Amino acid sequence: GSHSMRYFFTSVSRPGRGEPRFIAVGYVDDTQFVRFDSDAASQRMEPRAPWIEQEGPEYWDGETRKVKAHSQTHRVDLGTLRGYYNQSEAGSHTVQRMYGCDVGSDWRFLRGYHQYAYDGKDYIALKEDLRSWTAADMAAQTTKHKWEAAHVAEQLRAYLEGTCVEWLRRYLENGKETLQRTDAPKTHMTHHAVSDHEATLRCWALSFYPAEITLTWQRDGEDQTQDTELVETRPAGDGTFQKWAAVVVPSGQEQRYTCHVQHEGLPKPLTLRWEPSS
């Protein structure tokens, strides 16, 4: 369908001793497929999906070398940023970086992105044109001028529109049994007599993939937002996701309420209602 490849990098400085803690994770859609952890014993980029394990030693060597170079760049950046923001050498600070590409249903390039944050705030990001930079403040403006001088956006655009897309298509092909399979939500409704004259109806969506889903309640065919609670979509831990939406209703009026589920895995939206015998 529509697909994405994204890499996430986090470095956290350790002022007391040694290098920053560095964690890198790679995703295809909502599936983690590679990781690097500076605290792990291997010091190698490691596979996290069965379809990436078929890649040869040249692949793992290359990914390890690049990810280690990312770690060193973030180590130097943490020092640079401490200087730009006139901060002490005693505190712990964080740099985060995310980049990746999206392809449409025809597996052609849709968009690319490259964003960087310092202490959890936007620092500098590549604009959607893949040619220019958004600098959030004057420290990031200094970086923007350096990156303009070093042809950074050209090299990123070449990777995001070329390499990133070409490898994403390879991964989608190699991992087709899972990456291209949609897992429609397994739905059910629960009923919880919550007070004296009311009951909570909870509409569950389980074991679904990808994570994107919409759960909405209706009362007599009209959207109900009052007395509703929607939890954030959460990982089941087996690669699938879960979500629930609840509404508090007067007892005896349950049949007026319907839960509607929309997901990529459902050719027609699903409607659930509480049956009074259960």
Binding site: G26, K66, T80, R97, T143, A150, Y159, T163
Partner: peptide
Amino acid sequence: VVFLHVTYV
């Protein structure tokens, strides 16, 4: 595959 040219801020 990850990007090859990350540059200093």
